Design an enzyme around this catalytic site. Sequence first.
Site, PDB file in Angstrom:
ATOM      1  N   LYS A  82       4.313   2.599   9.462  1.00  0.00           N
ATOM      2  CA  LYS A  82       3.098   3.253   9.659  1.00  0.00           C
ATOM      3  C   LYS A  82       1.878   2.276   9.688  1.00  0.00           C
ATOM      4  CE  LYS A  82       2.412   7.281   8.425  1.00  0.00           C
ATOM      5  NZ  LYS A  82       2.094   8.606   8.195  1.00  0.00           N
ATOM      6  N   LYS A  90       5.575   2.562  -2.314  1.00  0.00           N
ATOM      7  CA  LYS A  90       5.538   4.396  -2.614  1.00  0.00           C
ATOM      8  C   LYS A  90       5.919   4.442  -4.043  1.00  0.00           C
ATOM      9  CE  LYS A  90       4.696   8.498  -0.782  1.00  0.00           C
ATOM     10  NZ  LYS A  90       4.032   9.221  -1.975  1.00  0.00           N
ATOM     11  N   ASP A 114      -2.179  -1.346  13.012  1.00  0.00           N
ATOM     12  CA  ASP A 114      -2.647  -2.881  12.531  1.00  0.00           C
ATOM     13  C   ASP A 114      -3.233  -2.595  11.391  1.00  0.00           C
ATOM     14  OD1 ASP A 114      -1.795  -3.944  15.042  1.00  0.00           O
ATOM     15  OD2 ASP A 114      -3.225  -2.960  16.317  1.00  0.00           O
ATOM     16  N   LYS A 143       0.831  -1.074  -0.038  1.00  0.00           N
ATOM     17  CA  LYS A 143       0.080   0.068  -0.121  1.00  0.00           C
ATOM     18  C   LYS A 143       0.973   1.262   0.062  1.00  0.00           C
ATOM     19  CE  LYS A 143      -4.423   1.286   0.125  1.00  0.00           C
ATOM     20  NZ  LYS A 143      -4.130   2.370  -0.668  1.00  0.00           N
ATOM     21  N   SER A 201     -21.722  -0.838   0.633  1.00  0.00           N
ATOM     22  CA  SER A 201     -21.258   0.164   1.573  1.00  0.00           C
ATOM     23  C   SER A 201     -21.603  -0.184   3.198  1.00  0.00           C
ATOM     24  CB  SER A 201     -22.113   1.506   1.293  1.00  0.00           C
ATOM     25  OG  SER A 201     -23.417   0.996   1.392  1.00  0.00           O
TER      26      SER A 201
END
Lengths: 496, 496, 496
Positions: B109, B121, B114, B85, B388
């Site tokens: 981070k 990146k 968690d 990520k 959602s």
Amino acid sequence: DPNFFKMVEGFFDRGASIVEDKLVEDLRTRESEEQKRNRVRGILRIIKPCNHVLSLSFPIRRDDGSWEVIEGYRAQHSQHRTPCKGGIRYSTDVSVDEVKALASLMTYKCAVVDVPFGGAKAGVKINPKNYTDNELEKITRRFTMELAKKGFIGPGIDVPAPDMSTGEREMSWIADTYASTIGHYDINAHACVTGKPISQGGIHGRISATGRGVFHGIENFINEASYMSILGMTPGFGDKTFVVQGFGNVGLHSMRYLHRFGAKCIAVGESDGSIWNPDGIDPKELEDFKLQHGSILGFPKAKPYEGSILEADCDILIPAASEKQLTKSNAPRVKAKIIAEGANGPTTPEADKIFLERNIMVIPDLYLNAGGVTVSYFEWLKNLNHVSYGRLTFKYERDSNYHLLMSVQESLERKFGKHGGTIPIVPTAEFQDRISGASEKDIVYSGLAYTMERSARQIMRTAMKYNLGLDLRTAAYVNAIEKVFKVYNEAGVTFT
Amino acid sequence: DPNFFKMVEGFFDRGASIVEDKLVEDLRTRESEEQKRNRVRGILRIIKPCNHVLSLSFPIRRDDGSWEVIEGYRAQHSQHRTPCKGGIRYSTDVSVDEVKALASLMTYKCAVVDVPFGGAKAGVKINPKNYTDNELEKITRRFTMELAKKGFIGPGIDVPAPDMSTGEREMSWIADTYASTIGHYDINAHACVTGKPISQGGIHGRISATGRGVFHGIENFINEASYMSILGMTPGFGDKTFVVQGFGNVGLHSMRYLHRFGAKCIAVGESDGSIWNPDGIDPKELEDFKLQHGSILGFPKAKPYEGSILEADCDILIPAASEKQLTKSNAPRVKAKIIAEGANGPTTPEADKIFLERNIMVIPDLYLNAGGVTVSYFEWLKNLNHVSYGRLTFKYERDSNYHLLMSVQESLERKFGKHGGTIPIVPTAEFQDRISGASEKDIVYSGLAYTMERSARQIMRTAMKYNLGLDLRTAAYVNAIEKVFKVYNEAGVTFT
Amino acid sequence: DPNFFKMVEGFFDRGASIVEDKLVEDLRTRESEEQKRNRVRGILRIIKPCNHVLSLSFPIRRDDGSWEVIEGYRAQHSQHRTPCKGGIRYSTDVSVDEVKALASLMTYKCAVVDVPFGGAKAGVKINPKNYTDNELEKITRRFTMELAKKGFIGPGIDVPAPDMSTGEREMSWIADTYASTIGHYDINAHACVTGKPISQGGIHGRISATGRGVFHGIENFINEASYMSILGMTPGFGDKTFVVQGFGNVGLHSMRYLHRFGAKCIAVGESDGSIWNPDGIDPKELEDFKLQHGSILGFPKAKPYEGSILEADCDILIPAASEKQLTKSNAPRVKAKIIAEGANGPTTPEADKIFLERNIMVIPDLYLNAGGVTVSYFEWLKNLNHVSYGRLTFKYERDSNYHLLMSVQESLERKFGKHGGTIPIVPTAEFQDRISGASEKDIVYSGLAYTMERSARQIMRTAMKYNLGLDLRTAAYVNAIEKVFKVYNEAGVTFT
């Protein structure tokens, strides 16, 4: 004294004949009447034998440099639900027949607790004591490679698990191997196996799952009026005492939750001696003693016990170790009214007859120890979900709860006095602990309790349906076969 | 004044040495004693360097007809969790070293909060002002194509995000390209990137997430007795005042939630001047003024401010813009007891020493601004869920709530008077608004608050564990390295 | 004396400008005239830089138990043809810049010999002498795993090869790893790498390919009338003598085939001394001596040689070891008319100028040593074909040949005498050996000779086309850029 494999075959045949009659006319009656027994009898013949069995011979290089070839088997009973599910055994006793029978068991066990997996089971013909840690990891990873290539492990295909001889470090090796190689492109790769450590995607609440499930199974039947009458006892747990045979995972945790709700453990045994204290052994103290020392022999709050513990005068006997402990010999002398099978097959069909005659209820292993399987299903779901349970809801619910209590508060103050007098906020102390300690295991235990209840009531309704009495074991297999049959029946089968 | 990349390497080395000692004997003690430091030191050496770095050179056809070749990089620090990520930057300053360092940051981070993602990146060596909208879409889609082919974007492999130079329109283009091509057959294709617009599968609550997350991180330490003593202040927010440097996304929303819970914003700055009003700037009024005009210069409720805003006498200073604002120069003159790092690396290790000596608490960027990342995790989950949040539960809960209040009502009327007198239904006004406005963001904010709390307590327990004091930054890195180490350690590593 | 990387960038820029002019009007003239130089210049800017570079950091567990992290890089210059192709180097000198430049080289080398692969090249930052065999296999397999997961190895994506520091045992490990894991389901898995052993799908004739390819390249230019005039020599091989610098693979086999067709090797050197004998060294005898002992020092048929061997009076000088052996210093004193670059970049652009001024023909490494690449293409094709060359045809062709000869026989006997007199069967002795020895290598050598000839004539036609003289190096790069340009131009590029 037959082998715990012909026993399973017999259980299936017994329940398959009981259901065949009924499946003609009591859950069916249709258009093509003459021989829809042809169709019912055919579906049952498909269900019985395991669909696929894989035999392996594969190499490891041992630590000393030598090569060794290793035998292993994994059988898949049914794919009427996928993935298949089932443990992996590491023992030189493993046989193709052992894994075919146990995988058959897993199908019916999973059906009882509404867990959507066909049965499966594996074994590797190896004594783990004869191998180093590095060799056991070599055997484990290579095994997974072979299973993957042949369609015997994958998140949507077949999800193995531990089995005494294996634990969470093998499961971790399996998950890692599949995720690095065959399943590298699979977003659900780590769902290929359950029983993993927490750090590898395991589920909180796994360790106590089977024992907690045993408590919930007992509880469901001990709170049922009709069943406790027909045994001459009162509902609830406060009246009762119980004995535990075996102090492994299942025995220890069974003792704990039975204690925490008002029963009286008066004897625990193990592979050596046993102990007795009719005042009530405390589970925390005994767990500390078994942890500190090698065994339970010599608990500083209970003398040793004479003869056989399976016969002590108490209300609930929990065989939580080693198959075939209640056989034709001791069966006529058992004092317990309820036999709660924590272990797998601790009762021969001989003892079943005697117990059925003496109005002694056997809550069968098929159902009673499915708690681990139920929670393995939950682990698989956690891994597909890619999030721990309640991670997104605990704090939302706390705020909802305090709004509810504040709404009761401001409503009463409006009806009566002023603005602070009535404080029907304050959660109780117990509510407060639960709010603070909110964790994944709370959800897991909830799901476990819900399943054990819906399945206990399903089995009772089956026992009444087929006019079985306290033969809960036959009602459990009939209930399973009914479910497996219904998936086949309402799908066609082949392309015909 | 080193570069925000050697800083991160230092932070890792500092925490790696602190943890290596402890990982020998305080979280470990085993069988092969002599040199399990060999294994601990080895795992830390694998963790530190980014695993994979991809350098690209790819073409776009500009609007005038000319061709241009474009450089770009994406680094993947760790796969101990997948997907990776991390955001994508569009700036001519991007260097392989920049992305390798920030991706390293993202691992630690994500571990602190968690979030189960390895760090990653990217950067494209491009100035977005020099390109039309049509050319920026051409660059973005082609970039995704290259990342996809090389294993640097996919729902289960690597999930990019925005980064100032990029926003939700690029994220949309990425999602669309991946879904139309390489991920056409993937039911989770639109989970390949976060930060998307709502219409493209983005998550409600994304805009305010980082700022809200900054409020929650401050709240957690400002309500802690021991920490607020050791700074000479009272818990809670009512007593305190605060200053904000930067009025972008993070600064604005930080000011809002700090205000809504009883703090007093007395100064806000930006790239030009700043303003001051010791009576308390209102966030809504200042947000309207910054929206209407270009900047904050000349707020009709606060004069301009003299000198440096980083030194005003207040309790909480929130650097919410531009790295290295608190350095060795102004550090000995800062009046704030608490330094809440909204931005990334706004504090040199010089200022860290001075602040640590002066008993000034620095709540580190590593933790304090992880709210956006925490909510990007939620967006990825929303996309895997294909629904959602709360879509299936809101109305079920309302009915449960009204049943609870009606149960309190009918119980009291039974105990006392008649049948309508006591109305301890009526939700409060606040409960009523919440019930009516029930939307996805309420769940997202709940999860965000839950995570920032569990992580703030985890970091405190680490600070006590390693006997760190107000050096919260070192406790945060030690906490992250502990977590990443545990996943490696409990998995093997290779096939060995 | 620049580095063999800026040299390659220069060679491209030189040829790119020569071709840009011509590509406007001498191979193009179209409708949108004004600035089709916009399109030509744009395509050349895409071609120059490598498209993708992957940097890795990955772990092995060393034999002693310790862990080590290993750096490595693989760059892919072009995908205008797929798979990419290029070797893997094991040396602590590997730099991202080294592999980016060599991969660029491979693109243009492959284009010269009409081999349909884009260029690629890899390196692992490791000294192979510091590692055991078991550790080198651990490094190699893990390297393949990382390459595969990121799209940097696969039969249709990227096909690596050896490079001095690596040989066929690494290539075998690569093939095995890819075939057992990421490429398990791929029928062409063993095509993922060339240079494999015969037993692993390697190709017969691989060892002698580069040397044989050097002979064929020399032959093509030494039989050309115009070129041998402009140097003042006669065509054919009988007149000439030659010197070889380096007695590795390329030097030895170059000497052998040049000898077998009538040239006179008068000096061979190596990392130590050299030798001289103007009567003619025999390649079999010198190969036996180099095999038996460590080096060539002290051949019992040639004295040691004084000074530099690069300057002996001979017609053909074959630099077959170590870059930059002919530089500005010795260049004005070289006696050879032809410089046959067996090695890669043995000539600085300094020496290029001097040699071009002195009418000394340099047959460039780009073309002259592409034999190995040409035969690696053949290995890849063998693996796709799943059958050795000629396996299905050798015996069919023998029968066809004997029918041809019998047809000449019976025709002549019918014209003249009787029925057995004229025996114009009998193959010659040479035809007989060839028929009996028919094997795969005979096909491979045929294809190699065919390619080196078609490419030599393609370069000659380029040299005349761009009015280059004996600057064969520039013609070879121009020829390659022309080919790569044509693939881009006739395809669009993006979706525009």
